[PDB]
Amino acid sequence: TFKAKDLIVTPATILKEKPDPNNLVFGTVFTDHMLTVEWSSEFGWEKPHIKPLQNLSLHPGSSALHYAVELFEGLKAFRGVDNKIRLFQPNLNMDRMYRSAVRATLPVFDKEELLECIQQLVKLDQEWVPYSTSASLYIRPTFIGTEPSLGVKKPTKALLFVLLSPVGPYFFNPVSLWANPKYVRAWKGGTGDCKMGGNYGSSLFAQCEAVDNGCQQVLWLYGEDHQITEVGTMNLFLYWINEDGEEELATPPLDGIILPGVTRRCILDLAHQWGEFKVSERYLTMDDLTTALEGNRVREMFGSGTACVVCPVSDILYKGETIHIPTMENGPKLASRILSKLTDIQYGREERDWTIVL
Amino acid sequence: VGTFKAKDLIVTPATILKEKPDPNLVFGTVFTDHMLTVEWSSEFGWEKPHIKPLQNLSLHPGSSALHYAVELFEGLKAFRGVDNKIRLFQPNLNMDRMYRSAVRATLPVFDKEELLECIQQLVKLDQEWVPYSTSASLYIRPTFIGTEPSLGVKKPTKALLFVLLSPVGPYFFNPVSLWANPKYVRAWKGGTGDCKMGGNYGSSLFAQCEAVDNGCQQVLWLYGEDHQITEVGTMNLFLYWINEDGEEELATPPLDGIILPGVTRRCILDLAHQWGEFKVSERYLTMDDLTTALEGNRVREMFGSGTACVVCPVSDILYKGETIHIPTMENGPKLASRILSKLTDIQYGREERDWTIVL
């Protein structure tokens, strides 16, 4: 494994102008520096670099281009209202990226060395961490196989790098979802519980089909009973009165077709902590939903993820009809409370072991 | 909404040419002198195609092919006939599959004829690499990748199409042993298993490793509660046997969405249908159908088909801690061998047929 202590820094000689915080398109503007660490089965890991944001030089046969031997992560840096820059649950991302690496047969690395390197990269480009309480700096760790051979096997050459991109919003701005059981995002025995590239390229066709049909995201359905799994590539939360008549906040269980979002776990933690309603990790089907709506039992439906934190849902185009979800006419009370809590913690307006300082 | 044209090819010869390897090669290990590349932007469409010296790709770190596997590929070969004339085999099908793939990936469409000609031109240039052997060929790897310099999961506004050339011999007869663990699923109804998109492959290296660890060379992909057998590693699966009706039969899974329509598969089905010596059935095959058959002496052969092996005999399957031997080798294998001879006779010009295009 590589070590932060060996970092080699090559500052850009011409720094870019920081963008306008009020209107940023997600992941389109990049900072001045990036992190890069090369690996080869022959000599192991080389020393990590922090150099000007540049194009990668890859052999046209790199397995990442042919067999999707790749995985990524998503985490943010926030400038606290006390002007101190913080990271949110960073070690959980390191753990997920590590487990995905193993399932991808990519080379392992010392989680703490990566986190420290990332902190240094952020520290160097710190002025990119927006001066806004509604904006942040997206951190994108990426791991690709660069095996020059076309043979399908464990890579003997790989690259690990990190990009920094100042972001505002990913897309309250409620969204409509397009539900069509003809497409499946992930399946049992699959790799859907990992952030491996191969899980997203296969979804673009359905995404496109949603856009030209009036929606902004796909509602992923699975199985014979049409379980509702995720809002686009965000975890799904349903706030309602369940079949037993008790107020409840529900989300699909981690049975292998659901990605264990950090946001997801935090909302469950805050929900369990408030103890004001039942919190269940259970299955939810379209019929559980439509049945519930015609009984006026649904209050809010939203998605969770690092980019949005939470993103309310107001409609679902299903069997040829549009099903309205009373999310926005109900506040959304909980959606807001949640977003309010999480950001309060991210920007240090509240102390809690979920953030890391500079 | 357009295409690039072979008539616009800008050729740039390498000044320093590499020495060809020994025709007797590690699959996809050695590459030729030149490559083909074609840039695409949603703003101006397809650029003009180039044939330049092999070289790295200069990609933006945010390229969508590295983050969301916005990619797809193909695999075909050129053969030097026993008449020294170089031949391509069923190219038009590869172009059709790549096309259908691009669309399923939301990558930009192109004129299949133009691409094919552009490929003939690339090979034509590097024809001396086409092995002077009868058991070796040149692997043609067309590749289509998204170069969207943005982290947003969306239809790419930038793409890159290229083609690599790699002289090769074999992939690994030489029977293989299969690892059958139902905990790993290659494809699912509603997914992209029936296209050659990179996302279907990265996710299997773990199972492959688990395979070797257990003395096996490939993974037998199982699907559904009834453990249907779908593909042998990344090759289509054929089972020559006496079915439940006592009839001689050549069976192979149907294209119901989780099997990739291989060119070698197509051919083997056409040959089988043509000879009309036994029943040819595209149907569901399960481990239980296989076990029941084996413990009844009803199995003749099992083998995978693909461009790299053409045909690959299966002799064993590790299932539920038990090793199940397949008598494929103790039966010639007559069918497997017959197929190999036939396809090879045709590819190397020994047999004349429409399945090839000379250059």
Ligand SMILES: *Cc1c(COP(=O)(O)O)cnc(C)c1O
């Ligand atoms: C990244 C991701 C999420 C959200 O996880 P967070 O760690 O909370 O960002 C949800 N679903 C999918 C499919 C994802 O890729």
Ligand SMILES: *Cc1c(COP(=O)(O)O)cnc(C)c1O
């Ligand atoms: C490419 C491929 C095949 C074989 O197709 P051929 O065109 O015969 O080489 C079989 N199965 C999978 C999963 C493939 O990707």
Ligand SMILES: NCC1(CC(=O)O)CCCCC1
């Ligand atoms: N829905 C978005 C992300 C997750 C998130 O932050 O919600 C995953 C795909 C790559 C961009 C990020």
Ligand SMILES: NCC1(CC(=O)O)CCCCC1
């Ligand atoms: N089994 C192999 C291939 C197909 C083939 O030619 O059999 C697909 C994966 C990438 C290498 C080629």
Ligand SMILES: [Mg+2]
């Ligand atoms: Mg250590």
